[PDB]
Amino acid sequence: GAYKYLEELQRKKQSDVLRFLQRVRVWEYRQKNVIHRAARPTRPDKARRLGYKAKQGFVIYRVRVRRG
Amino acid sequence: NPLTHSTPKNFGIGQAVQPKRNLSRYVKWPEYVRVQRQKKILSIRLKVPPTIAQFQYTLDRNTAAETFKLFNKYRPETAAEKKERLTKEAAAVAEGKSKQDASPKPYAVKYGLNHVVALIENKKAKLVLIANDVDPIELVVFLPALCKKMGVPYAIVKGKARLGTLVNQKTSAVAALTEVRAEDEAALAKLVSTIDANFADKYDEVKKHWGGGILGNKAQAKMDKXXXXXX
Amino acid sequence: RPRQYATVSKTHKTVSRAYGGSRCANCVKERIIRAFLIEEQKIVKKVVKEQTEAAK
Amino acid sequence: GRVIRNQRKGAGSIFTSHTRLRQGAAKLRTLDYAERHGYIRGIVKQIVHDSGRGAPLAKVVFRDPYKYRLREEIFIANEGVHTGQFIYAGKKASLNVGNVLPLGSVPEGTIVSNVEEKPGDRGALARASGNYVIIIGHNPDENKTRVRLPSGAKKVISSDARGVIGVIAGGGRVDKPLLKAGRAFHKYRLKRNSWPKTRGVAMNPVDHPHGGGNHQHIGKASTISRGAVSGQKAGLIAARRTGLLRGSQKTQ
Amino acid sequence: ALKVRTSATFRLPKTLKLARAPKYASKAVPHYNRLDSYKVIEQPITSETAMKKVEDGNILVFQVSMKANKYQIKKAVKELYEVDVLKVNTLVRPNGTKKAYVRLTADYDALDIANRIGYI
RNA sequence: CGAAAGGGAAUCCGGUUAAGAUUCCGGAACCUGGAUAUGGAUUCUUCACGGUAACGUAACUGAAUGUGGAGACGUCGGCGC
RNA sequence: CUGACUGUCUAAUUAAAACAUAGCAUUGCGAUGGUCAGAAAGUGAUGUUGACGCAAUGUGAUUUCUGCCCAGUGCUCUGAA
RNA sequence: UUACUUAUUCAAUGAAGCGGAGCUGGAAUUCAUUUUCCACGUUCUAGCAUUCAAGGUCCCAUUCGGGGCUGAUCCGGGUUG
Ligand SMILES: [Mg+2]
Ligand SMILES: [Mg+2]
Ligand SMILES: [Mg+2]
Ligand SMILES: [Mg+2]
Ligand SMILES: [Mg+2]
Ligand SMILES: [Mg+2]
Ligand SMILES: [Mg+2]
Ligand SMILES: [Mg+2]
Ligand SMILES: [Mg+2]
Ligand SMILES: [Mg+2]
Ligand SMILES: [Mg+2]
Ligand SMILES: [Mg+2]
Ligand SMILES: [Mg+2]
Ligand SMILES: [Mg+2]
Ligand SMILES: [Mg+2]
Ligand SMILES: [Mg+2]
Ligand SMILES: [Mg+2]
Ligand SMILES: [Mg+2]
Ligand SMILES: [Mg+2]
Ligand SMILES: [Mg+2]
Ligand SMILES: [Mg+2]
Ligand SMILES: [Mg+2]
Ligand SMILES: [Mg+2]
Ligand SMILES: [Mg+2]
Ligand SMILES: [Mg+2]
Ligand SMILES: [Mg+2]
Ligand SMILES: [Mg+2]
Ligand SMILES: [Mg+2]
Ligand SMILES: [Mg+2]
Ligand SMILES: [Mg+2]
Ligand SMILES: [Mg+2]
Ligand SMILES: [Mg+2]
Ligand SMILES: [Mg+2]
Ligand SMILES: [Mg+2]
Ligand SMILES: [Mg+2]
Ligand SMILES: [Mg+2]
Incomplete structure (x- = not known):
């Protein structure tokens, strides 16, 4: 299934593809509020992994803390 | 008529309160408007790697509408159809024999991303349509080249919303047929032939080219001006 | 005083002109x-x- | 040691400006189509007095380019200006005292008040009683006109920045001796709790580095290095020299 | 196509704005009327200072609820006793009780009405 | 939210108690919000006349919008009342 | 002898000659800044401000002057390296 | 040493008139052509400037009410620095 291609993609974090995705999305996130509800996991292969089943009553939230 | 006069307005600087023109350009739109507007825009400058620039290549209205009217002939079982088929098959076959094979071997469109993948993986599929708008894009980026290596004819179609209702859903991402009744295999070729000359033989050459740029309007005519004028 | 003018008649708050x-x-x-x-x-x-229009 | 006075001023509290009696802040007109392109008349409705600011304020009423209404802007009265005057503002304006023109649009040698640093900040330079910048020259290499500010520092700004012809009214304010102490008391009553000033060599060593005694002297140098720490900056700070000079003229 | 916006300003588009259609009705059975008449007017204030008021002044002096108001006082004197109430006057006693003075219209005799209520 | 000393819609004399009163009694007012009718005014030149004028009067239709005024303002001093 | 003066302070042992003052002199700064505040900050004072300004030291009305020294401490620099 | 504008940074505005090009029209070169320049509502006065605008032109049979296109050139949706 498609997940093993998400897992393996997600591990080439300096591949030119991801860098570009890393860029565009790290920009998108800054603009929305610091805690904002997530329409749907950016990483479906991973939210799956850590427990998330894509069903009612599961909730994914994105968040931004401050480094250092 | 000469009892009405023709008193004309000036609307130049320093006189005549300006007339309600149109401000759609100058609207201070909601934040969530600009974000989606500016993410595409951002994704328009900066060079785009090819494996994402592979998309944008959608399809012509014609082969699209061709490949749809074809796929439309293989809808899944609807609710009340699987309903009665099971009141039919289950009730009688378990009151007799024919291991549930109380029904014709079906010919549906097949969908579900992991699923359509294991198809392509196993060389069981015949024509795969990948939507050009999935998010994240990684959900699909491997397909165009996963397809190519298995040699499974693919094509990057327009509408994750179309393929959806094409498989009786809100959205679908992928839709790909492996079977098809024998009365159709002829349109198969003429569709795969013309496609496999846009999404297949083109692949190798296409992945060698990135996208992005497009200074947008102002700064581009300004370089269209520095060039035209200063040369 | 201001609110008192609301208890008074228009001829008390104008001339005619x-x-x-x-x-x-x-x-x-x-x-x-x-x-x-x-x-x-x-x-x-x-x-x-x-006149300066039809002059030039 | 204690917290010396000049640090206690940063938080606010007692030292924040007294502003009750102040007419609205002085600002030019916002840089609109009109001024960016043509000009726009206005009448000085009155010239008025803004507390603790010797320098009269001018009230100029401009019809609204876009809606039926009047917008009163608050200018600093540039001397010569007079109730009933008409103030025209904008690239195309003419060269008269009181009008507000971009720095591009004025010849060299024009002296000019309330000029903007960055075009459209509504006024930055020479807003003090009787001050004025001077245009020293232009340079079409980005609309940047070179001007001389009242310090004498000739700093380049963008010729799209606006000014207002003439010199700031309120001429020789600081030529009259304040004489007695009350005069000065009232001066700052309308400004900020800055006065009187105690010398720190009166203090004890805890409220100032000049502090301790047995003899009112300063101790070591009274020139402190640009990059000392607050609590040691008191005295002549980045003093690149000291002593009497009579300097004559400035930087040209 | 497009759309003509004469206002640079975007505003929250007016939306439906429904209306509460429950499914289990908050309270079970609404409260009975707190401050009924007998609750309003609490007790007659029979003191020689106040008797002389009923005698030579046509005033009925009742202690009343603190929640009560002038309107409510005039009401329940008027219903419980079948009398017209010129005007009501309330002062809050030092022990927290709300003494109300009620003058009855020239129709009714407050002294009659008084040993009518049963007290002299 | 922040003034029982700032801004602020309108009450007065007489009388009364052992102790309350610009509250109570007696008389005479005024403000506000709400109602509505009659008298008047206006009108065939429909939305009033007059006065050269400053202005007058028992009135004398007025939505948006604009604007202007009152609220609203230091201190001393001599002079007038 | 002292401090120019009016003025301020050790509530409860010091009212002075002390502190302040006006006047004089000096220093930093043109906002991408000077000084100062904050754990941080889409933070804050000066600032409704812009050198006739704000900030920081000295001396202490007027008059009259304000010499010599840049080696040391320190501050400063369109300076060789 | 430096061009880019999307990250980041700062200024304003009730995100109005930015950017490219066109009507109109007055001069030019070229030994004729488009090869470009240029301009295109306000300055004796302490008035007035608002009702999707009067005009113009199409519609509904139009009884009074509406509406549209010009009036206000078009094309980019980079609010503007
Ligand atoms: Mg959901
Ligand atoms: Mg940290
Ligand atoms: Mg089904
Ligand atoms: Mg300390
Ligand atoms: Mg303040
Ligand atoms: Mg004021
Ligand atoms: Mg002098
Ligand atoms: Mg203060
Ligand atoms: Mg003080
Ligand atoms: Mg001093
Ligand atoms: Mg001092
Ligand atoms: Mg001491
Ligand atoms: Mg110390
Ligand atoms: Mg030290
Ligand atoms: Mg000393
Ligand atoms: Mg009471
Ligand atoms: Mg309040
Ligand atoms: Mg009434
Ligand atoms: Mg006023
Ligand atoms: Mg007052
Ligand atoms: Mg006054
Ligand atoms: Mg002696
Ligand atoms: Mg003394
Ligand atoms: Mg003294
Ligand atoms: Mg003592
Ligand atoms: Mg002792
Ligand atoms: Mg004393
Ligand atoms: Mg000194
Ligand atoms: Mg002293
Ligand atoms: Mg001296
Ligand atoms: Mg010396
Ligand atoms: Mg000598
Ligand atoms: Mg030295
Ligand atoms: Mg040396
Ligand atoms: Mg050095
Ligand atoms: Mg803008």
């Missing part, structure tokens, strides 16, 4: 004159700078 309250007699005379001379001399500005 352009700008009842608001402006004072001579301030409306100057209002008038200035108005008349400006709009007149406007045309004068127009006709004259239409």
